[PDB]
Design an enzyme around this catalytic site. Structure first.
Site, PDB file in Angstrom:
ATOM      1  N   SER A 292       0.755  -1.239   0.000  1.00  0.00           N
ATOM      2  CA  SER A 292       0.000   0.000   0.000  1.00  0.00           C
ATOM      3  C   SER A 292       0.794   1.303   0.000  1.00  0.00           C
ATOM      4  CB  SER A 292      -1.016   0.005   1.140  1.00  0.00           C
ATOM      5  OG  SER A 292      -1.952  -1.024   0.906  1.00  0.00           O
TER       6      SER A 292
ATOM      7  N   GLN B 102     -10.915  -4.743   0.707  1.00  0.00           N
ATOM      8  CA  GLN B 102     -10.523  -5.483  -0.479  1.00  0.00           C
ATOM      9  C   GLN B 102     -11.678  -5.632  -1.457  1.00  0.00           C
ATOM     10  OE1 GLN B 102      -8.446  -8.878   2.145  1.00  0.00           O
ATOM     11  NE2 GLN B 102      -7.295  -8.473   0.249  1.00  0.00           N
TER      12      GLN B 102
ATOM     13  N   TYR C 245     -10.365   2.684   5.642  1.00  0.00           N
ATOM     14  CA  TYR C 245      -9.257   2.462   4.729  1.00  0.00           C
ATOM     15  C   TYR C 245      -9.598   1.342   3.746  1.00  0.00           C
ATOM     16  CZ  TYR C 245      -4.392   1.230   3.482  1.00  0.00           C
ATOM     17  OH  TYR C 245      -3.231   0.914   2.852  1.00  0.00           O
TER      18      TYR C 245
ATOM     19  N   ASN D 245      -8.890  -0.449  -0.391  1.00  0.00           N
ATOM     20  CA  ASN D 245      -8.361  -0.553  -1.752  1.00  0.00           C
ATOM     21  C   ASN D 245      -9.458  -0.316  -2.774  1.00  0.00           C
ATOM     22  OD1 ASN D 245      -5.959  -1.499  -0.661  1.00  0.00           O
ATOM     23  ND2 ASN D 245      -6.599  -3.629  -0.914  1.00  0.00           N
TER      24      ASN D 245
ATOM     25  N   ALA E 116       1.837  -3.291   2.920  1.00  0.00           N
ATOM     26  CA  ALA E 116       2.014  -4.717   3.067  1.00  0.00           C
ATOM     27  C   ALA E 116       1.512  -5.472   1.870  1.00  0.00           C
ATOM     28  CB  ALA E 116       1.286  -5.231   4.319  1.00  0.00           C
TER      29      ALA E 116
ATOM     30  N   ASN F 102       6.089  -9.347   6.016  1.00  0.00           N
ATOM     31  CA  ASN F 102       5.046  -8.454   6.525  1.00  0.00           C
ATOM     32  C   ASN F 102       4.972  -8.498   8.068  1.00  0.00           C
ATOM     33  OD1 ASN F 102       2.754  -6.915   6.963  1.00  0.00           O
ATOM     34  ND2 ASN F 102       1.313  -8.414   6.103  1.00  0.00           N
TER      35      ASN F 102
HETATM   36  B1  LIG Z   1      -2.016  -2.071   1.914  1.00  0.00           B
HETATM   37  O1  LIG Z   1      -2.339  -1.509   3.227  1.00  0.00           O
HETATM   38  O2  LIG Z   1      -0.689  -2.704   1.952  1.00  0.00           O
HETATM   39  C1  LIG Z   1      -3.103  -3.120   1.459  1.00  0.00           C
HETATM   40  N1  LIG Z   1      -3.364  -4.140   2.446  1.00  0.00           N
HETATM   41  S1  LIG Z   1      -4.352  -5.381   2.124  1.00  0.00           S
HETATM   42  O3  LIG Z   1      -4.774  -6.005   3.362  1.00  0.00           O
HETATM   43  O4  LIG Z   1      -5.522  -4.944   1.435  1.00  0.00           O
HETATM   44  C2  LIG Z   1      -3.539  -6.579   1.111  1.00  0.00           C
HETATM   45  C3  LIG Z   1      -3.995  -6.766  -0.190  1.00  0.00           C
HETATM   46  C4  LIG Z   1      -3.412  -7.722  -1.017  1.00  0.00           C
HETATM   47  C5  LIG Z   1      -2.350  -8.502  -0.528  1.00  0.00           C
HETATM   48  C6  LIG Z   1      -1.714  -9.483  -1.291  1.00  0.00           C
HETATM   49  N2  LIG Z   1      -0.606 -10.161  -0.918  1.00  0.00           N
HETATM   50  N3  LIG Z   1      -0.297 -11.059  -1.898  1.00  0.00           N
HETATM   51  N4  LIG Z   1      -1.252 -10.948  -2.867  1.00  0.00           N
HETATM   52  N5  LIG Z   1      -2.129  -9.983  -2.470  1.00  0.00           N
HETATM   53  C7  LIG Z   1      -1.897  -8.293   0.762  1.00  0.00           C
HETATM   54  C8  LIG Z   1      -2.466  -7.339   1.574  1.00  0.00           C
HETATM   55 CL1  LIG Z   1      -1.829  -7.134   3.178  1.00  0.00          CL
END
Ligand SMILES: *[B]([O])([O])[C][N]S(=O)(=O)C1=[C][C]=C(C2=NN=N[N]2)[C]=C1Cl
Ligand SMILES: O=S(=O)(NCB(O)O)c1ccc(-c2nnn[nH]2)cc1Cl
Length: 358
Positions: free
Chosen positions: A61, A117, A147, A149, A315, A340
């Protein structure tokens, strides 16, 4: 490599690596505007490849800061406005809950409860339209921050529509290339695979999996050198020759909403400096960072404040990244690791380093 920088970096990061069992790590400190690099351990354990200044890490992120700046650049170009309805750029979004949801809300996680997500079941473009049409907000727009995505990722995809460029094309030509980030990628090219670290999760080597809006929300990979240059660019945007990019960086650090002691920018998050380290350390824990929180609008937004702790955690399954900087002090840090590990440990280490140098 001034001894003071060497010493505080090594005295902080060595125990962090031991405590967290981090396989490989790269750190850059930007001090009085110049970068200093440090590396430890392994990019690939099985093949015994060390972390170097050329190793690519998944930023997770921290990618949202690139998305925010790219959107800022699109605003500066007059291609979009944050006050525009989402439907201006996605007219197929006809469901009534979208009335009143603007690009600002998408950019800043304030649309009313878009989820962290995008569902894994969303595989096709039609699946994505169905998801947003069917999504029911828990809250009125501009009232709570969650928060997500699915929020800023959609902002990034819509921000580039007027340009006619793909998200990746727009990012490359409008952000990476002008800033000379020539080892920063949304998709790692074959030429660079020798440098692409493995992430490690439960002892297994892993890379990020494909997903909807991945590029826009968490899909950038970069080296410690490019990330130091990213910090330099965000510390001193007026040095940037490309006018709309300079302005976009300024827009991404403007303060749009407040929750507690934190201000939401575009991708970047900010606190007033000097910060209470407990405020940012504890605040970075996902128990807080990912929570639903009421927000106060900053009406109108405050332009980028130089006396700020500006930062972002990132992460993926196998990687943990952190960037923080203080424009007023020309000081910053990047921490890239291929595990992570908990956010609070990242923030504590960054604060220990920057406070000692400030
Ligand atoms: B950001 O805060 O880093 C997003 N964090 S998350 O929880 O949405 C997320 C999304 C996707 C993945 C991922 N890892 N390997 N393939 N997809 C990890 C995380 Cl931590
Ligand atoms: O009032 S604003 O906060 N709006 C932010 B925006 O439309 O995303 C603002 C902040 C900074 C700047 C600016 N441009 N160049 N230097 N500062 C402009 C605006 Cl409108």
């Amino acid at each position: 490599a001034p001894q003071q920088i060497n010493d505080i970096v090594h005295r902080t990061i060595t125990p962090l690596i031991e405590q967290q069992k981090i396989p490989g790590m790269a750190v850059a400190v930007i001090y009085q505007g110049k970068p200093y690099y440090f590396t430890w351990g392994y990019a690939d354990i099985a093949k015994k490849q060390p972390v170097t200044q050329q190793t690519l890490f998944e930023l997770g992120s921290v990618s949202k800061t690139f998305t925010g700046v790219l959107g800022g650049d699109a605003i500066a170009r007059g291609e979009i406005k944050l006050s525009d309805p989402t439907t201006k750029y996605w007219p197929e979004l006809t469901a009534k809950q979208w009335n009143g949801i603007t690009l600002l809300h998408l950019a800043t996680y304030t649309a009313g409860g878009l989820p962290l997500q995008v569902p894994d079941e969303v595989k096709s473009s039609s699946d994505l339209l169905r998801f947003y049409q069917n999504w029911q907000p828990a809250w009125a727009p501009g009232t709570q921050r969650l928060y997500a995505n699915s929020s800023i990722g959609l902002f990034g995809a819509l921000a580039v529509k007027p340009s006619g460029l793909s998200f990746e094309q727009a990012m490359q030509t409008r952000v990476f290339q002008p800033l000379k980030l020539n080892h920063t990628w949304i998709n790692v090219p074959p030429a660079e695979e020798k440098n692409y670290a493995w992430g490690y999760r439960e002892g297994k080597a892993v890379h990020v999996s494909p997903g909807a809006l991945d590029a826009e929300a968490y899909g950038v990979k970069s080296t410690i050198e490019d990330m130091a240059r990213w910090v330099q660019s965000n510390l001193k945007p007026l040095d940037i020759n490309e006018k709309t990019l300079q302005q976009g960086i300024q827009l991404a650090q403007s303060r749009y909403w407040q929750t507690g002691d934190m201000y939401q920018g575009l991708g970047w998050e900010m606190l007033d400096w000097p910060v209470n380290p407990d405020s940012i350390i504890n605040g970075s824990d996902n128990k807080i960072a990912l929570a639903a929180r009421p927000v106060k609008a900053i009406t109108p937004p405050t332009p980028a404040v130089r006396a700020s702790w500006v930062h972002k955690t990132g992460a993926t399954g196998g990687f943990g990244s952190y960037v923080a900087f203080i424009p007023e002090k020309e000081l910053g840090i990047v921490m890239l690791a291929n595990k992570n590990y908990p956010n609070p440990a990242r923030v504590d280490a960054a604060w220990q380093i920057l406070n000692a140098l400030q």
